[PDB]
Structure 1
Amino acid sequence: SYLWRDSEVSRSGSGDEPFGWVPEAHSVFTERILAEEPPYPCYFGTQGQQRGNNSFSAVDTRYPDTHGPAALARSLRAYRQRAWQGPKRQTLIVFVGPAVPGAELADDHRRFWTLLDELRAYDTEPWPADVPADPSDPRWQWCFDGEPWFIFAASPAYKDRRSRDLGPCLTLVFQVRRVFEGIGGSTVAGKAARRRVREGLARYDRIGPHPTLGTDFKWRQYTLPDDDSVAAPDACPV
Structure 2
Amino acid sequence: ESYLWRDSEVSRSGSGDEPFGWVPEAHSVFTERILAEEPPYPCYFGTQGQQRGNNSFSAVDTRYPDTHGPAALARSLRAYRQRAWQGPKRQTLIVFVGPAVPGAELADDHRRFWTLLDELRAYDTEPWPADVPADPSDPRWQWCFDGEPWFIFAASPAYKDRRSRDLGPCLTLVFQVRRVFEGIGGSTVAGKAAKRRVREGLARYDRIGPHPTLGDTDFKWRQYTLPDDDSVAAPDACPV
TM-score, normalized by the shorter chain, greater than 0.5: yes
The whole-number CA distance in structure 1 between the counterparts of 2:65 and 2:103 is 22
User: Which structure 1 residue ranges, 5 or more long, are not aligned?
Assistant: none
The whole-number CA distance in structure 2 between the counterparts of 1:91 and 1:141 is 17
Question: What number of residue pairs does the alignment pair up?
Answer: 238
CA-CA distance at 1:86 after TM superposition: 2.2
The whole-number CA distance in structure 2 between the counterparts of 1:180 and 1:24 is 30
Q: Deviations over 1:42-89 (max 9, x none)?
A: 000000000000000000000000000000000000000000012100
Which residue in the other structure is 1:101 paired with?
102
The whole-number CA distance in structure 1 between the counterparts of 2:74 and 2:16 is 25
Local SS of the residue matching 1:150:
strand
Moved over 2 A (4+): none
The whole-number CA distance in structure 2 between the counterparts of 1:15 and 1:224 is 33
Which residue in the other structure is 2:64 paired with?
63
CA-CA distance at 1:163 after TM superposition: 0.1
> What is the TM-score when the length of structure 2 is the normalising length?
0.99
The whole-number CA distance in structure 2 between the counterparts of 1:199 and 1:140 is 29
5 Å matches for 1:4-15? 4-15=5-16
The whole-number CA distance in structure 2 between the counterparts of 1:225 and 1:112 is 13
- Fraction of identical pairs, as percent: 100
The whole-number CA distance in structure 2 between the counterparts of 1:64 and 1:103 is 19
The whole-number CA distance in structure 1 between the counterparts of 2:87 and 2:161 is 36
- Root mean square deviation of aligned Cα: 0.2
CA-CA distance at 1:221 after TM superposition: 0.1
The whole-number CA distance in structure 1 between the counterparts of 2:123 and 2:28 is 30
> What is the TM-score when the length of structure 1 is the normalising length?
1.00
Which residue in the other structure is 2:129 paired with?
128
Q: Deviations over 1:123-172 (max 9, x none)?
A: 00000000000000000000000000000000000000000000000000
Local SS of the residue matching 2:154:
strand
The whole-number CA distance in structure 1 between the counterparts of 2:10 and 2:238 is 33
Local SS of the residue matching 2:86:
coil
Q: Deviations over 1:160-218 (max 9, x none)?
A: 00000000000000000000000000000000000000000000000000000011000
Local SS of the residue matching 1:195:
helix
